[PDB]
Amino acid sequence: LFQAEKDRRVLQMLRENLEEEAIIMKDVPDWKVGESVFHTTRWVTPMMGELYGLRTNEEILSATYGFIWYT
Amino acid sequence: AGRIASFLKNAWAKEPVLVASFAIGGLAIILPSLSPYTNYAIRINRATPYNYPVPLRDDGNMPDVPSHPQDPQGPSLEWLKNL
Amino acid sequence: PFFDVQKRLGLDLDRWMTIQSAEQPHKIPGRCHAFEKEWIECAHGIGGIRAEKECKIEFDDFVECLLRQKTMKRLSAIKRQRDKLIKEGKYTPPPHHLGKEDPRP
Amino acid sequence: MTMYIAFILSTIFVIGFVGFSSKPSPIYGGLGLIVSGGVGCGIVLNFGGSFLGLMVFLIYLGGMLVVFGYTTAMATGDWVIYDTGDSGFFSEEAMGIAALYSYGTWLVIVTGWSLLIGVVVIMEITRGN
Amino acid sequence: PGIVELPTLEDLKVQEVKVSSSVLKAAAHHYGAQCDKPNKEFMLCRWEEKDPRRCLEEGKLVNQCALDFFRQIKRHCAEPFTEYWTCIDYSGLQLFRHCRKQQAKFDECVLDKL
Amino acid sequence: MWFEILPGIAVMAACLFIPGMATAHIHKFTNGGKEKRVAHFSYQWNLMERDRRISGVNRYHVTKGLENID
Amino acid sequence: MFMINILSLIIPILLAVAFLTLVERKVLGYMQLRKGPNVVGPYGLLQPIADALKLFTKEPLRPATSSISMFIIAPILALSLALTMWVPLPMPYPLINMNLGVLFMLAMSSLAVYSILWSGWASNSKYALIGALRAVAQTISYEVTLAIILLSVLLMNGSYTLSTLITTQEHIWMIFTSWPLAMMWFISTLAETNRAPFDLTAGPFAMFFMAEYANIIMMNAFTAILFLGASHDPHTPELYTINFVLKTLALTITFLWIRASYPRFRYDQLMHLLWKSFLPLTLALCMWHISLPIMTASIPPQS
Amino acid sequence: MNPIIYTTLIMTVMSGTMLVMISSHWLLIWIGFEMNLLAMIPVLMKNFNPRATEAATKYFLTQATASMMLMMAIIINLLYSGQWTITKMFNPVAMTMMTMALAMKLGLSPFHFWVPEVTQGISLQAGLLLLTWQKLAPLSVLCQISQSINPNLMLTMAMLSILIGGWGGLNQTQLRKIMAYSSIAHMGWMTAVLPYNTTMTILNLLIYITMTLAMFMLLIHSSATTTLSLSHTWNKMPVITSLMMVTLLSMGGLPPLSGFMPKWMIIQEMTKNESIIMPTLMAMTALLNLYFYMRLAYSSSLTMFPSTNNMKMKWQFEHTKQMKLLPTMIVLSTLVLPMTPALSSLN
Amino acid sequence: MPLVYMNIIMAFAIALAGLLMYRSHLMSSLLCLEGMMLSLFIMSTLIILNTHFTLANMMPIILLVFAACEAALGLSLLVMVSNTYGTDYVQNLNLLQC
Amino acid sequence: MNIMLTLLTNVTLASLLVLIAFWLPQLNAYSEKRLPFSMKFFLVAITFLLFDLEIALLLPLPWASQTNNLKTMLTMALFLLILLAASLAYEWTQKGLEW
Ligand SMILES: CCCCCCCCCCCCCCCCC[C@@H](O)O[C@H](CO[C@H](O)CCCCCCCCCCCCCCC)COP(=O)(O)OCC[N+](C)(C)C
Ligand SMILES: CCCCCCCCCCCCCCCCC[C@@H](O)O[C@H](CO[C@H](O)CCCCCCCCCCCCCCC)COP(=O)(O)OCC[N+](C)(C)C
Ligand SMILES: CCCCCCCC/C=C\CCCCCCCC(=O)O[C@H](COC(=O)CCCCCCC/C=C/CCCCCCCC)COP(=O)(O)OCCN
Numbered sequence A: 001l002f003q004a005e006k007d008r009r010v011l012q013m014l015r016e017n018l019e020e021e022a023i024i025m026k027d028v029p030d031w032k033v034g035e036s037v038f039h040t041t042r043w044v045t046p047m048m049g050e051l052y053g054l055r056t057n058e059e060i061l062s063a064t065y066g067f068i069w070y071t
Numbered sequence B: 001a002g003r004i005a006s007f008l009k010n011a012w013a014k015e016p017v018l019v020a021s022f023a024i025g026g027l028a029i030i031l032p033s034l035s036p037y038t039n040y041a042i043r044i045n046r047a048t049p050y051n052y053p054v055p056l057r058d059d060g061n062m063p064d065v066p067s068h069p070q071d072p073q074g075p076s077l078e079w080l081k082n083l
Numbered sequence C: 001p002f003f004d005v006q007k008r009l010g011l012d013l014d015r016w017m018t019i020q021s022a023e024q025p026h027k028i029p030g031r032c033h034a035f036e037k038e039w040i041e042c043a044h045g046i047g048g049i050r051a052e053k054e055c056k057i058e059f060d061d062f063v064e065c066l067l068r069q070k071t072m073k074r075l076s077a078i079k080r081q082r083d084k085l086i087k088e089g090k091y092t093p094p095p096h097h098l099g100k101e102d103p104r105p
Numbered sequence D: 001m002t003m004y005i006a007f008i009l010s011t012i013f014v015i016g017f018v019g020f021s022s023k024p025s026p027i028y029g030g031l032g033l034i035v036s037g038g039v040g041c042g043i044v045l046n047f048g049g050s051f052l053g054l055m056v057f058l059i060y061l062g063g064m065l066v067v068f069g070y071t072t073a074m075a076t077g078d079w080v081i082y083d084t085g086d087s088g089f090f091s092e093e094a095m096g097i098a099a100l101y102s103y104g105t106w107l108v109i110v111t112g113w114s115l116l117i118g119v120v121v122i123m124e125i126t127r128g129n
Numbered sequence E: 001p002g003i004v005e006l007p008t009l010e011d012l013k014v015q016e017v018k019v020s021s022s023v024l025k026a027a028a029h030h031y032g033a034q035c036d037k038p039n040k041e042f043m044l045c046r047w048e049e050k051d052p053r054r055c056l057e058e059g060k061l062v063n064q065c066a067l068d069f070f071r072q073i074k075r076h077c078a079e080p081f082t083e084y085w086t087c088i089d090y091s092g093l094q095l096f097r098h099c100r101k102q103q104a105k106f107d108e109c110v111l112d113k114l
Numbered sequence F: 001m002w003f004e005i006l007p008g009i010a011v012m013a014a015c016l017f018i019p020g021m022a023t024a025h026i027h028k029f030t031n032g033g034k035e036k037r038v039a040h041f042s043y044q045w046n047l048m049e050r051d052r053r054i055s056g057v058n059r060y061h062v063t064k065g066l067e068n069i070d
Numbered sequence G: 001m002f003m004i005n006i007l008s009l010i011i012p013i014l015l016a017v018a019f020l021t022l023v024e025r026k027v028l029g030y031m032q033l034r035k036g037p038n039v040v041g042p043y044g045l046l047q048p049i050a051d052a053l054k055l056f057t058k059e060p061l062r063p064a065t066s067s068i069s070m071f072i073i074a075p076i077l078a079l080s081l082a083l084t085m086w087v088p089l090p091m092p093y094p095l096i097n098m099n100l101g102v103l104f105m106l107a108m109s110s111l112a113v114y115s116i117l118w119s120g121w122a123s124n125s126k127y128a129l130i131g132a133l134r135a136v137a138q139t140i141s142y143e144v145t146l147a148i149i150l151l152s153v154l155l156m157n158g159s160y161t162l163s164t165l166i167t168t169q170e171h172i173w174m175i176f177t178s179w180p181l182a183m184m185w186f187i188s189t190l191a192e193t194n195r196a197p198f199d200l201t202a203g204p205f206a207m208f209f210m211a212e213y214a215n216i217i218m219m220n221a222f223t224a225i226l227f228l229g230a231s232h233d234p235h236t237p238e239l240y241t242i243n244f245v246l247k248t249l250a251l252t253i254t255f256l257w258i259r260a261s262y263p264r265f266r267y268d269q270l271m272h273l274l275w276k277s278f279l280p281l282t283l284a285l286c287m288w289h290i291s292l293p294i295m296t297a298s299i300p301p302q303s
Numbered sequence H: 001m002n003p004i005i006y007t008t009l010i011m012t013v014m015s016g017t018m019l020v021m022i023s024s025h026w027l028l029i030w031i032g033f034e035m036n037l038l039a040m041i042p043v044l045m046k047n048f049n050p051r052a053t054e055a056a057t058k059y060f061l062t063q064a065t066a067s068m069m070l071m072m073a074i075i076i077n078l079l080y081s082g083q084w085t086i087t088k089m090f091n092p093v094a095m096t097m098m099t100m101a102l103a104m105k106l107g108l109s110p111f112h113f114w115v116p117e118v119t120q121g122i123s124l125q126a127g128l129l130l131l132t133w134q135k136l137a138p139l140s141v142l143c144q145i146s147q148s149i150n151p152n153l154m155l156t157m158a159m160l161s162i163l164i165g166g167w168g169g170l171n172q173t174q175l176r177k178i179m180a181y182s183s184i185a186h187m188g189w190m191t192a193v194l195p196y197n198t199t200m201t202i203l204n205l206l207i208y209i210t211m212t213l214a215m216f217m218l219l220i221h222s223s224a225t226t227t228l229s230l231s232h233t234w235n236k237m238p239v240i241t242s243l244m245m246v247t248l249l250s251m252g253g254l255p256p257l258s259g260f261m262p263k264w265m266i267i268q269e270m271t272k273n274e275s276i277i278m279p280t281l282m283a284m285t286a287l288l289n290l291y292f293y294m295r296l297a298y299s300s301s302l303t304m305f306p307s308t309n310n311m312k313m314k315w316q317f318e319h320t321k322q323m324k325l326l327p328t329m330i331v332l333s334t335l336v337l338p339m340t341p342a343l344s345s346l347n
Numbered sequence I: 001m002p003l004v005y006m007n008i009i010m011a012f013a014i015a016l017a018g019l020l021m022y023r024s025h026l027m028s029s030l031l032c033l034e035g036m037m038l039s040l041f042i043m044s045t046l047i048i049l050n051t052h053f054t055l056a057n058m059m060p061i062i063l064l065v066f067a068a069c070e071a072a073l074g075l076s077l078l079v080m081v082s083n084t085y086g087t088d089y090v091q092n093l094n095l096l097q098c
Numbered sequence J: 001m002n003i004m005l006t007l008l009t010n011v012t013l014a015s016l017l018v019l020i021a022f023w024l025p026q027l028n029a030y031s032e033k034r035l036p037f038s039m040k041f042f043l044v045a046i047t048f049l050l051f052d053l054e055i056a057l058l059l060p061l062p063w064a065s066q067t068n069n070l071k072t073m074l075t076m077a078l079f080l081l082i083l084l085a086a087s088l089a090y091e092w093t094q095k096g097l098e099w
């Protein structure tokens, strides 16, 4: 169950990031919305910076350092 | 024979710490190869599930692989419970 | 120079630590396990010169996984454009990126 | 996101190295080196390496720099490259370190022989005559 | 090079399981015993496809099966389960060792009913 | 006599009593009246994060029981 | 409400250390057929306050020629380490719960020699320098054996977590499992804090005094947790707190008793004591404690 | 020191060298280098005095710095490519630091300054060991990464090494400094053919090791550390002086002696690789090494220097402790030119 | 390649330059060597932990052990030099010259 | 964040109380009127450093008990401790622990 929920949450976060990318990158001349940085079409696990790039600093800091700082 | 016994007697006096240290170290070296429970410890270490057991793709020719955890097929840990 | 004792004797003295995808304890995977596996399988049995000439795509993908330079450049460009637009004022973040969303398990 | 705390610690590390690299009054260079070692421990512990950070902070600071000070006294951007998943129900760093006895037999053998040889070398050099 | 395909938000919509970790831990053994088939199908597909986007239907199925499991628990043995998971939730480590008594009460209620 | 030593030992005993009881009381107060959740190994931390997301008040110790399953 | 927890951990330790000195005098006095302070206060209870006020009103004899820097830093580091060493310990619940608490305590003790080194070097005298070198050598020598003993004992615990020691000793004390290691640990903790029979040596002076006494009480508490495990009931931690404080006070009184009972070693005599009696036994028992869980198939769980 | 301790230290040195050559992991190679450095220091300090201690501390400083630079090269290579196997370097910056660290270990110019001083400080047996056995490991590591080295850097450092050795050998009276400068020049000759053919490098290494073993054993046989003390050898053992003159002629590259083989083969290979100016410069520069070899031979055997009255008592006593393999080393270092095509074994 | 790695590399370069300067006091030379090793340790630890290459967690401990052994060797050599000359000044090592 | 705050509180209290201790008796006006270098201390310091390094090698033992290679792990740990004992014995026999 945890694996399924994690996959669904990651996919939703990626989709929201893609939608906001489409909104922002409209007037950029040579930008392609949702373009890969890898030649292969295989699924690649996203970084912390890909999912929380455009979000608030509080939850970015949480998702990156909370487990280390939780004592 | 007699010389070794006399040397051990002389060392047990005025040098008990070294005799005890050597005895404990040598005993700790020899004993594990003779004790029968080291196999039990290895089995307990193998029987500890750290990862998720990934299921196998059934093809109709695996009688030893269970289809449900409650099925008799597969390893049993009744020996650990009896310990 | 290189006296290859190990392969002659089949000893495996220090090969177990050479690559990420080689028998990690508790089957812990490397971050770039798949890319390194693909590159190694591409370049096996071919030679260094031909491996460099032919397996360049796999090596590029592996290095991109390792250092993520292109990903950081892309994210920085997106963030810079977003900051420029919010500075001018034609863009407003949605509630998802302002902490007012509905979280899920 | 606290103003690039990793960047701040790295800069403090660099300033500490600038401080003790000028080599003024070797005791003060020593204090600069303890400061820089503590900052490096902070960096390692903040990144996620608890055991390796404590390894530095114990061995390096308490033994090696202490012997250095003893001998002197006798004389006159970030957060994006991180992971996404979890580690299971154990710390990967500690398990990989503890695999030294099950996997790194060669490493243990060579390190132990090197330390014994180093003891012999120290005794021979300090013999004098 | 290429475009990453991501399923739309309508494909990710499903009735979530809104119970806490202690509640899940209290029924973890029975949940594993009962809901094993969809979970194993999902996990086999997960390691075989190596792609999260290829396993959405199995995730929905396992969510539905877990929901059915919890609905049966609520229908039959709500109160012993409530006591058991409250006990589990009180402890910081969530130890099964603490209240084998409540565990046995829940187990006997489940065995008698379902 | 020897029992005149006792007042100082009792003062030290109370002083040493204060930290443990204070910490336990603060842990109960700040964790919804229950024992503080300890989280090593990065899995129970994920459990705490999931509980925080499920609670709806951004607090992990607020437990949602079987009544939230509808 | 975390600053409140930190203050309620720190201040009672300071009161206990101040009161501990009064207790020490009374115990020694009654072992010497006399009384301790009993005039200042009902039973000498006001003696620590008078001592503190007199120390804080007397001028500090700064040499006016040495480096003021380390002269002021050394008490800071000493007191900071002494107060910081308290947080990892679980009574029953630790202020800060760390996975590798034991290594943290060991690293703190390792840094504890820098205060001695800097105080000796900043005294601007060669004789105090010799004394500081002797003390530093003794401390590092005995901390080696501390580390070996501690890892050998934790081999029966499963990890370096201090909270797990309570679960390990739920049914039996660790004193029964390994009493020789406890004996050597007790002696090494005596030699660590420069306590008799190993004691070869106004504001900052009292600073160092409180640092040393906090280290003493901390060492007794750590020994009690490591070797005399109390039962912990999650619904009433006050019982565990009371039992732990009783054991810690018993061990502190044991240090006072040992000081009042024995003459003191020479420097070379204690150096030989360590390097020729404790280290061989420590290595032999480390080998034995490595081998024992494997022989008996009793390896501790957590990993 | 105790013979057991000396034998164990020698074993540790050679086992570190073996671990360096047989390991496929960068960390194990670094460990072998550390083991070699750790066990080498007491050998340099077998005869305790201020000179040996100063030489040993200079050597330790240089080798520790080189090892740290090598470790950073390994770290940067790992950063830019998650590989530990000794293969192509994968980073331009990493290669530059690895090359400089290995050259500092070898003593190539401009990292040559420590070699003459360390050779002068230590005794003759220590100098023999330092100049023979301490080159196997860095040269093996360089041969393993031959396709990665920047040819410009390797060739310019080799040319600098040859020039420095040839120029510095002219000013020396002590023999140990002469051997050190000869070692520097031969190191440059070895490392200038690495980008083209490592077999030539190994052949030059073997010929150099044989010749320098013969020369150091001859210097041990007749207790001479300066030119004048060597000039007294003809009065007691003229055979030693004649053999040393023949060996010195061999080291200069004069045919038909063995020393001509490495220069000839390296020049031939580099002319295969369309390089013409460099081998000519190498030959005209090695003429200087030949000049100071000729001066030493003049002072040693081709003339008779004045003697002393006390040599008559030395006439009556025989060299008691006789070393083996000296005739074999001389024969190999003088008369193996006709067996040149045997280099195809990839020695 | 992020900025933390750049900072660590600059720290190592600063330590190397300080080692190569030699104002005086060989003790400072050993201090610079140890600082270089500390930079090596921190950088290797970050690189190894970042990529989740579990089997390489062994390496920093081995590096620290070997480098501290080398540091002890250098300390012994410096002690003997100082005992010979009375001080650890660099210029006293001028008896052997090129 | 918690341990940083705890360390900051410890250092802050220590500094504040040390400064008040050093400044309270200064407000009122008053009159306000080598070579030896023993080798044994350095030798024991170096011995401590070497044994500390070998202890650092020996530290990860508690997790090494769960590897499924119990025989190999036991052999390696016993080998490390045996070499520690051998180092101590070698320093003992040639008078490395004398005063
Ligand atoms: C002064 C002239 C040189 C004299 C050299 C010393 C002569 C005595 C040495 C005694 C025997 C040495 C070798 C030991 C015999 C078995 C070793 C064998 O199993 O190893 C082989 C190694 O082969 C040996 O090296 C060949 C030995 C022949 C050396 C003599 C060649 C000298 C030619 C020019 C001088 C004329 C010499 C005249 C007689 C001495 C396998 O090679 P391999 O591991 O797979 O590849 C590694 C090498 N790579 C990396 C370059 C590819
Ligand atoms: C063949 C030539 C032998 C004589 C020449 C010796 C040369 C110098 C001595 C050094 C060589 C020793 C070889 C040790 C290499 C280790 C690998 C080999 O021994 O196999 C190991 C066998 O393990 C044994 O326990 C090794 C014990 C041997 C070490 C004890 C004595 C070592 C002394 C060596 C010299 C050190 C100084 C002198 C000490 C007296 C690995 O066990 P295994 O389980 O399959 O694989 C682990 C990987 N897993 C996780 C996938 C399972
Ligand atoms: C085979 C197992 C290996 C592992 C076990 C050992 C691990 C740790 C123990 C060894 C630590 C280091 C030992 C170093 C030994 C040094 C001996 C020495 O030099 O001391 C001699 C003296 O010591 C001796 O007599 C030499 C050895 C004495 C006996 C040693 C033990 C011999 C075997 C005893 C045990 C036999 C087996 C156990 C059976 C017991 C019955 C159950 C000089 O002493 P000084 O302090 O200088 O005194 C001078 C002024 N009086």
Ligand SMILES: CCCCCCCC/C=C\CCCCCCCC(=O)O[C@H](COC(=O)CCCCCCC/C=C/CCCCCCCC)COP(=O)(O)OCCN
Pocket (backbone or CB within 6 Å): B014, B015, B016, B017, B020, B024, G175, G180, G182, G183, G184, G186, G187, G197, G223, G227, G258, G262, G273, G277, G278, G281
């Ligand atoms: C079948 C498997 C069984 C496994 C075998 C295990 C059995 C082990 C049996 C042997 C145990 C012996 C080790 C116990 C400690 C030994 C330490 C020692 O021997 O050192 C003393 C020295 O120790 C001291 O003298 C230090 C004393 C300092 C004063 C301390 C006072 C202690 C009394 C107060 C109470 C102590 C409380 C201890 C327990 C604390 C619990 C937390 C001997 O040295 P010397 O007399 O000088 O002789 C050398 C020349 N021949």
